[PDB]
Design a binder for this molecule. Structure first.
Ligand SMILES: [Zn+2]
Lengths: 1129, 56, 40, 40, 40
């Protein structure tokens, strides 16, 4: 048959309308079969976690000791390669204690069990796969439906329920590994016991489904409430009193208060996890009716919204003129209506902003701002074709509902046309050339009458959220997304940089200064933070509130009735909700209103639409409310979550300011139809949040657990394969290490995760060889191997670097330390040098090598789905990029720019970037790397992606078990690695390259003890002087010495150390003369200090980084480059 | 040649002031009639009718 | 060429007078627009 | 410079014609919007 | 001088376009209030 049960991870919401349709005698053939296998006790699909939580496996069913010894070997090689060798006795012991404890080990084996069954059952032409035993459970897989059984109890499920159970087990495996590796590296002891207690406590809650996810949703606000209640010193808060955890689950309550008693920081890290547990089944009828009711509710009167919208327009006008005077030193083109004040006239003619205007914004109701700029109606289509699912037209509504269910429910056929009858995505509309004339399509929005084919919106629930009634996002048609792109681009470009409250957020230096002043300020009794959360932010805005500011934007951008069509658009848009087997009724080809499944006409559109307007609108009433009570305020704003910084007044205690500020904000929130609740806002001076990072006493809270416990999308934009899974794991380790997670924890987690991700797919012949597993984790994508979290230098260092010296350093350390010969390295690397130089690969990546990478999958969308272009359509502008080869023109310009005799790949990659060629390759890259094209083009041509998966799996297994060697790399793996990378680049490319070779720091610089350093080593070194003796708690508290800038993990330790460049005897500080990148060297010295402190040692004397490789210091000159041949571009 | 050129120019400037003053009032009338028609259109199948005439 | 200036002047004064009377009828339109939006 | 002044006077005259048609349109609008109050 | 005539000529030309936009806009509002009479 066709492909079935395609997804390998949870991407869709968990709905149960199909199970209800199946259990009420459907006439579909697979429903009869699925109804047959159910037992006498059939549980509801909502209690699937009660049935999946009873799985127990026999102990030690999978032999994984080879993985343990291999992981110790890999980490010993890396720690020996950095020449930071106090770390390994903490590191391999941490990995061994992680994988030897049985409670962690059982969750590993359970992870491999679900991963193997997902590997077997997905993408199968077999409709019904027979009984598959997972421990003590039997599974029958009848198309989408899943039948589980233990003894006599059963549960009819969909396949997303099984994927949610698999992802829950995967998340717990990540959490149990990361907890051990993180807790090995504090002064504070291990905390695995509390994590196991939390697992048993949450698994011991025998409560109904809604109440259980009420407890699950509320764990992190309650823990934050306990921390805020115990650790507030000036303002008093009562946030913990709302929640029902002490009166429903006392066992969770005692655990959270004992973790609060031991460590405040630990409670936030443990309580931040919210996707390591099971996921709710969304009650579609009740949540749907509440959603369609929340789009039609009128909390305030129509006239009061219009009056307060005029009041918000006044302060918008005030901030725009303030920003224009602050930047361009003159007033904008404005019109003064009769009755204007004399101060406004005198300040307009003099071109000056007085301090007294900001407190009097009622005067700015007669100043009409004229045409500032014009509207760029043709936008960038980088963001047009990405991240959104888009319906073609109105008549595609019949394709989201089953015909048989509609036949039984309403008694007549759907009469759906069998063809797709529209573009599946935006680029499919680009093939047909609808988007060649963007103003001709935005013209019905401009006049004011949008077409009948564009007034439909489908509401899709959002996956992996903890709300039992669900959250919903808008799926719109073609024109309204282009409208949103033009509107948001216009506001972000011209409107927002003038407004100061937004301009401080969109500027890096001002935001850094504000967050740096906050951390020093809050601990010394000055300033406090007020947080507001809007539960109905996107559904609360109304047409009366937006229309004054929308009209003023129409006048400023000289676009007639353009921002004012979006407010009146919800009152004419048909709203249907996407859940098949519950279809809306159709009368004449159009949906019919019944209040639950269809709605003809709301008063708001949905979540994420018109965002930049509502952000300005949200800021306006807060500026009004806090200026009316005379407090110094700074507003940092991220959508529905607003955090407000309020400083001290000298007369009044801060509790009084908190009461008056909450009163003013609650007063001015009510007038816009957005009622804040007293049970969802806290005022604190110790705890705050900005940019998904929580801050306690001015120090960031470690977020290793949440980032590593997150399950990524996996096998990105392709058919399932090993390469993309390891690439997703490597990207997840790098993205976790970006946001202040320690590089050792991410590295030691990722080694074990990489090994288990191999063990799921690779046959038992490979995985019982220790030396092969040690080498295969140390090859990397640089020299033709697999993606690897170990081989990246971007983990330890922020900036981009040259990967080849690091790779040769690891592979050189492997031969000298571990008992591995060079024959196995030549077996796993398989270096196949191409006789033809491919300069295009060099300018797409300046450090790449002319090698053969056989593990990278075929793209198949690149320029190879071109068959639809020649048949479906005739004239379009995207076909100009597709039908002609820009690869041949790129190769031509590559041979043109290869003639530069002092060849610089960085300069070449610049000149392609400044040209039309690599720009067009970037456009073609945007079409292949986009959402809604991959899934839709994957759903068409169904069998090829599964057949390619089987072919690639057989190919990678036969390649990995092959023992044929490649190029002999013994001279490239001896001596210095800097010259080795140069000679290897000469071997692949044929010509020498100067400028892209960055020598690796531990190769370049050798840490030495201060008492035991040799004099020739002491002569050329960088001295790192501590001001006092440094111990474990110095990594938390910032020191007296100033921060340079480094990486953020050693920033606190950098404030206790003084470093200076004292190698001037050999090299006089090398400003633009030699190959020393100072940020890497100072970061490496601070990493030496960190490795000494965290391994049980102390630092008392100034330590030194001494030069070790003489050849690693080679000149960069004032070298002129001459491009010899004439350009044929 | 003072009175002709610059007093007639001042008259056209006063005319332009008065026209923008009228344009603001017509814009407020447009807001009220559009939001009233939009509130009428909720729950029915009333057509969308245009407000601004045509692009130049 | 003061004569054609006078000829255009006799009409350009009537332009401002017409603008004032259209402002008058715009406010008289605005009153019944507002009354309408007040009560429905 | 008489031709520019003459075509200027023609522009002022057609602007006066435009304001006369605008005034007639506003009177027709008021006759239309009187039906609001017997309607409700 | 010709150029000082040209400036005020452009200044008197643009308002004739503005009048036509206001007239057609207010006729569209006439159609809207006609549907409002039809509804009530
Ligand atoms: Zn070296």
């Amino acid at each position: 048959a066709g492909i079935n049960r395609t997804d390998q991870s949870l991407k869709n919401p968990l709905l149960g309308t199909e199970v209800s349709f199946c259990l009420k005698s459907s006439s579909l053939p697979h429903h009869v079969r699925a109804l047959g296998q159910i037992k006498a006790r059939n549980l509801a699909s909502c209690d699937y976690y009660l049935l999946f939580r009873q799985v127990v496996l026999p102990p030690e069913v999978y032999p994984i000791g080879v993985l343990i010894r291999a992981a110790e070997a890999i980490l010993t090689v890396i720690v020996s390669a950095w020449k930071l060798e106090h770390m390994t006795k903490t590191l391999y012991s941490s990995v061994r204690y992680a994988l030897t404890n049985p409670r962690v080990r059982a969750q590993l084996e359970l992870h491999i069990a679900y991963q193997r069954i997902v590997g077997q059952v997905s993408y199968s032409r077999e409709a019904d796969i027979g009984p598959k035993r997972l421990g003590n459970m039997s599974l029958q897989f009848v198309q989408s439906l899943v039948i589980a059984t233990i003894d006599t109890t059963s549960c009819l499920m969909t396949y997303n329920h099984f994927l949610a159970a698999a992802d829950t087990a995967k998340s717990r495996c990540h959490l149990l590994i990361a907890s051990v590796v993180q807790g090995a590296l504090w002064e504070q002891g291990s905390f695995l016991d509390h994590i196991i207690n939390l697992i048993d406590t949450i698994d011991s809650i025998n409560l109904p489904h809604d109440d259980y996810f009420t407890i699950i949703k509320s764990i992190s606000p309650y823990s934050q409430g306990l921390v805020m209640g115990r650790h507030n010193v000036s303002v008093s808060s009562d946030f913990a009193s709302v929640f029902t955890i002490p009166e429903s689950c006392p066992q969770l309550d005692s655990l959270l208060k004992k973790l609060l008693q031991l460590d405040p920081v630990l409670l936030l890290m443990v309580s931040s996890v919210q996707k390591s547990w099971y996921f709710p089944e969304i009650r579609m009828v009740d949540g749907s009716r509440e959603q369609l009711h929340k789009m039609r509710v009128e909390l305030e009167t129509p006239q009061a919204l219009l009056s307060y919208g005029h009041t918000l327009l006044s302060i918008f006008r005030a901030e725009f003129i303030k920003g224009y005077v602050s930047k361009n030193a003159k007033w904008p083109p404005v019109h003064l209506l009769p009755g204007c004040d004399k101060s406004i006239k005198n300040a307009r003619e003099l071109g000056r902003w007085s301090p007294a205007f900001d407190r009097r914004w009622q005067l700015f109701a007669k100043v009409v701002i004229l045409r500032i700029a014009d509207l760029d109606m043709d936008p960038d289509f980088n963001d047009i074709v990405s991240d959104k699912a888009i319906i073609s037209s109105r008549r595609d509504w019949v394709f989201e509902y089953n015909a048989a269910a509609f036949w039984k429910k309403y008694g007549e056929r759907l009469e759906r046309p069998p063809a797709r009858s529209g573009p599946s995505r935006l680029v499919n509309a680009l093939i047909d050339g609808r988007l060649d004339n963007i103003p001709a399509l935005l013209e019905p929005f401009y006049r004011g009458a949008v077409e009948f084919e564009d007034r439909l919106t489908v509401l899709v629930p959002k996956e992996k959220e903890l709300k039992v009634k669900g959250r919903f996002f808008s799926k719109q048609t073609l024109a309204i997304r282009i409208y949103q792109v033009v509107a948001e681009a216009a506001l972000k470009n011209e409107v927002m940089p003038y407004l100061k409250t937004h301009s401080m957020t969109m500027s890096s230096t001002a935001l850094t200064h504000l967050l740096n002043r906050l951390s020093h300020t809050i601990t010394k009794g000055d300033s406090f933070v007020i947080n507001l959360d809007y539960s109905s932010w996107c559904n609360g805005f109304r047409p009366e509130l937006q229309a004054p500011i929308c009209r003023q934007l129409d006048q400023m951008f000289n676009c007639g009735y353009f921002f004012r069509t979006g407010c009146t658009l919800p009152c004419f848009t048909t709203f249907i909700i996407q859940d098949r087997f519950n279809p809306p009724y159709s009368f004449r080809g159009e949906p019919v209103e019944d209040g639950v499944t269809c709605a003809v006409g709301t008063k708001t559109m949905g979540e994420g639409m018109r965002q930049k307007l509502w952000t300005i609108l949200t800021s306006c009433w807060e500026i009004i409310a806090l200026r009316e009570i005379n407090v110094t305020f700074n507003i940092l704003g991220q959508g529905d979550n607003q955090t407000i910084i309020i400083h001290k007044s000298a007369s009044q205690n801060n509790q009084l300011l908190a009461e008056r500020a909450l009163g003013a904000l609650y007063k001015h929130a009510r007038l816009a139809g957005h009622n804040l609740k007293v049970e969802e806002c806290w005022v604190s001076d110790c705890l705050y949040e900005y940019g998904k990072k929580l801050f306690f006493r001015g120090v960031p809270v470690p977020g290793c657990l949440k980032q590593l416990s997150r399950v990524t999308d996996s096998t990105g934009e392709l058919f399932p394969n090993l390469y993309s899974k390891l690439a997703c794991l490597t990207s997840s380790c790098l993205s976790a290490a970006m946001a202040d997670t320690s590089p050792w924890v991410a590295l030691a987690t990722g080694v074990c995760l990489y090994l288990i991700e191999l063990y799921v797919e690779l046959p038992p012949a490979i995985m019982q060889d220790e030396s092969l597993l040690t080498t295969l984790c140390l090859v990397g994508p640089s020299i033709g191997g697999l993606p690897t979290p170990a081989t990246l230098p971007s983990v330890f260092f922020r900036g981009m670097s040259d990967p080849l010296p690091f790779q040769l350093a690891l592979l050189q350390t492997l031969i000298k330390t571990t008992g591995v010969t060079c024959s196995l390295v030549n077996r796993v690397v398989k270096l196949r040098i191409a006789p033809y130089p491919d300069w295009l690969s060099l300018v797409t990546d300046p450090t790449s090598l002319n090698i053969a990478q056989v593990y990278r999958p075929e793209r198949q969308i690149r320029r190879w789905i071109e068959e639809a272009i020649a048949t479906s359509s005739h004239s379009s502008r995207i076909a100009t990029f597709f039908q002609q080869p820009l690869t041949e023109m790129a190769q031509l310009l590559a041979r043109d720019l290869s003639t530069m005799m002092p060849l610089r790949p960085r300069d070449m990659s610049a000149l392609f970037a400044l040209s039309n060629v690599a720009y067009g390759l970037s456009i073609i890259d945007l079409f292949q790397k986009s959402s809604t094209v991959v899934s839709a083009s994957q759903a068409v041509h169904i069998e090829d992606v599964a057949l390619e998966s089987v072919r690639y799996k057989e190919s990678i297994i036969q390649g990995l078990l092959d023992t044929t060697e490649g190029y002999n790399m013994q001279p490239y793996l001896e001596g210095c690695t800097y010259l080795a990378a140069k000679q290897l680049r000469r071997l692949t490319w044929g010509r020498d390259l100067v400028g892209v070779t960055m020598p690796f720091v531990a190769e370049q610089f050798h840490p030495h003890s201060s008492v035991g350093a040799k004099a020739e080593l002491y002569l050329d070194a960088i001295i790192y002087c501590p001001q006092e003796t440094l111990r474990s708690h110095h990594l938390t508290t910032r020191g007296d010495q100033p921060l340079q800038g480094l990486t953020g993990y050693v920033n606190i330790l950098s404030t206790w150390l003084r470093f200076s460049s004292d190698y001037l005897h050999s090299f006089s500080k090398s400003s633009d003369d030699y190959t020393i990148h100072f940020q890497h060297v100072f970061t490496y010295g601070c990493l030496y200090a960190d490795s000494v402190i965290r391994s049980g040692g102390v630092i008392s004397t100034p330590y030194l980084l001494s030069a070790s490789c003489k050849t690693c210091f080679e000149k960069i000159d004032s070298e002129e480059f001459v491009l010899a041949c004439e350009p044929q571009y | 040649h003072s009175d002709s050129i610059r007093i007639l120019g001042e008259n056209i400037k006063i005319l332009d002031r008065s026209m923008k003053t009228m344009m603001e009032t017509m814009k407020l009338m447009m807001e009220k009639v559009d939001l009233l028609y939009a509130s009428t259109a909720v729950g029915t199948s009333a057509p969308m009718l245009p407000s601004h005439p045509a692009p130049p």
